[PDB]
């Protein structure tokens, strides 16, 4: 068999500052735009209090891809982008990684490597206008498809026939923008819903924003478990004489393995080496002679 | 080369195994871990053969 020690204690460290941030400021908003404006907010520099979303039962399901929704409270991010656009709530299927659809081919595009949430839910009176709905309008067919996460502010009349349609609408000439004329007492099932996209960036920088988890103290000279802001591992932490330059956070070795770490609160240098393991070998004479054994830990 | 093959992706969404287990609980961790295991196993077999 194989031999390997188990950790005894566990340590979690991430920077001291918390600064509870207003997730709901984009949820309890004033007005929304259809497809042209979504304000590309950058909620960050805080602690992600995702508990504010699943405590209320008046929402749709956390139907999104990349991370298990219940696990969203134990991930540590770098930058979060919230997309605020509102579209029909019975047509809310085109917002998925790599799916077709007209709004999914000449409007907002999600990438095929979308590692973020697309949480969306109902809208009853806040979105639906009082005494007629004429403002929430979306642009019609475009020249071609658009690149993911790209704005489409530029507007111009499409020309494919003999008419440039420069204010001469009619007689085989069209203008994409038109008034819907939605009176209130209509098919509320057709009412647009609140659609938000919370993209995640697990790519570039050491983690900066994450939940209210509690930070313990430091343990030394012990095969230990640790979570220094994403840098998970199993090993022994001794203070090493590696002279970090200020901007440097992690440490890596010849074969691209994590080797040295600094504390996100105390700035102390530390390193990482696997705690002892190996194989176990049994030494014995033939069982026909005696039943004694000697054992070796490789 | 055998060591360097560990950092590769093989079609999953990440190479480090704990992070996969740190984002995805019930079946989808397993659908990714299938690809990870297949790739690593083939690399090991090749190494043993040479």
């Amino acid at each position: 068999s194989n031999f390997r020690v188990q950790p005894t204690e566990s340590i979690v460290r991430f920077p001291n500052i918390t600064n509870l941030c207003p997730f709901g400021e984009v949820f309890n908003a004033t007005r929304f735009a259809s497809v042209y404006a979504w304000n590309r907010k950058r909620i960050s520099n805080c602690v992600a209090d995702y508990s504010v979303l699943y405590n209320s039962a008046s929402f749709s399901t956390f139907k999104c891809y990349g991370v298990s929704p219940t696990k969203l409270n134990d991930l540590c991010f770098t930058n979060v982008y919230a997309d605020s656009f509102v579209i029909r709530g019975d047509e809310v299927r085109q917002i998925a990684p790599g799916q077709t659809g007209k709004i999914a081919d000449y409007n907002y595009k999600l990438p095929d490597d979308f590692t973020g949430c697309v949480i969306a839910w109902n809208s009853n009176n806040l979105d639906s206008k009082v005494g007629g709905n004429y403002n929430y309008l979306y642009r019609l067919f475009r020249k071609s498809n658009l690149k993911p996460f790209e704005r489409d502010i530029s507007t111009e009349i499409y020309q494919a026939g003999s008419t440039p349609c420069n204010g001469v609408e009619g007689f085989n000439c069209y203008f994409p923008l038109q008034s819907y004329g939605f009176q209130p007492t209509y098919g509320v099932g057709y009412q647009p819903y609140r659609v938000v996209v919370l993209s995640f960036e697990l790519l570039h920088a050491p983690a900066t924003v994450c939940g209210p988890k509690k930070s313990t103290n430091l343990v030394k000279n012990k095969c230990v478990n640790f979570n220094f802001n994403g840098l998970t591992g199993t090993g022994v932490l001794t203070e090493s004489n590696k002279k970090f330059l200020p901007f440097q956070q992690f440490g890596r070795d010849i074969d691209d393995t994590t080797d040295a770490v600094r504390d996100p609160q105390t700035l102390e240098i530390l390193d990482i080496t696997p705690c002892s393991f190996g194989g176990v070998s049994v030494i014995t004479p033939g069982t026909n002679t005696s039943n004694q054994v000697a054992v070796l830990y490789q | 080369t055998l060591v360097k093959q560990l950092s590769s992706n093989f079609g999953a969404i990440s190479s480090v195994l704990n992070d996969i287990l740190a984002r995805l609980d019930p079946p989808e961790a397993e659908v990714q871990i299938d690809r990870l295991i297949t790739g690593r196993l083939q690399s090991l077999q090749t190494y043993v053969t040479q």
């Binding site: 074969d255 393995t257 696997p274 393991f277 190996g278 194989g279 490789q298 | 055998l2 060591v3 560990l6």
Partner: peptide
């Protein structure tokens, strides 16, 4: 130093890990 000769000394001087891997 050990027990070797001049030639064997030249011969040794002339010739110059726990993520699963092990060395016996």
């Amino acid at each position: 130093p050990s027990k070797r000769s001049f030639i064997e000394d030249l011969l040794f001087n002339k010739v110059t890990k726990f993520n699963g891997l092990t060395v016996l």
